[PDB]
Every structure is written in C-alpha cells, then in structure tokens.
C-alpha cells in the first residue's frame, strides 16, 4: 500500500561552504545536500546529480513537520 520515495539523507547546509577544490562539494546555506556515504567525520553529499565531500559539521538533518492534509 502506498509508495513513498526516499534516498540518502537529506541535510541542510547550516553555512555556505565554498571549496576552491572540485573535490569538496560546493554549496550554500539552505541548500539541500543528499548524503549517502559517510566516511569518518566528513561525509559525501550530493545535489541533484553532483558529488563531493563536505564538513558534516556544516550540515543539519532536514527536519520536516508531519504534514497531514
């Protein structure tokens, strides 16, 4: 019954992190980073279809109210 679509962990960038290196994922505060791989402290996030590393200390758990109706 029903079909809920999910994937990775939805996190919000608490602060805008700009990396000069194409290795670290570049995003701004508020952006929605989809975490999938967590290696140590720094986890690998994604955006739409991007990939890179970022400070896990610069991301929060996308908290959304239990929308109902």
From Swiss-Prot:
Species per Swiss-Prot/TrEMBL record: Homo sapiens
Segment forming the signal sequence: none
Name of the gene this protein is made from: ITSN2
Location of this fragment in the whole protein: 983 to 1038 of 1697
Function: Adapter protein that may provide indirect link between the endocytic membrane traffic and the actin assembly machinery. May regulate the formation of clathrin-coated vesicles (CCPs). Seems to be involved in CCPs maturation including invagination or budding. Involved in endocytosis of integrin beta-1 (ITGB1) and transferrin receptor (TFR). Plays a role in dendrite formation by melanocytes.
Tissue expression notes: Expressed in melanocytes. Ubiquitous. Isoform 1 is primarily expressed in adult heart and liver.
Assembly and oligomerization: Belongs to a complex that may contain multimers of ITSN1, ITSN2 and EPS15, and different partners according to the step in the endocytic process. Interacts with ADAM15. Interacts with FASLG. Interacts with ANKRD54. Interacts with FCHO2. (Microbial infection) Interacts with herpes virus 8 protein K15.
Domain SH3: 8-63
Protein name as catalogued: Intersectin-2
Other comments on record: Overexpression results in the inhibition of the transferrin uptake and the blockage of the clathrin-mediated endocytosis.
Subcellular location: Cytoplasm
Disulfide bridges in this chain: none
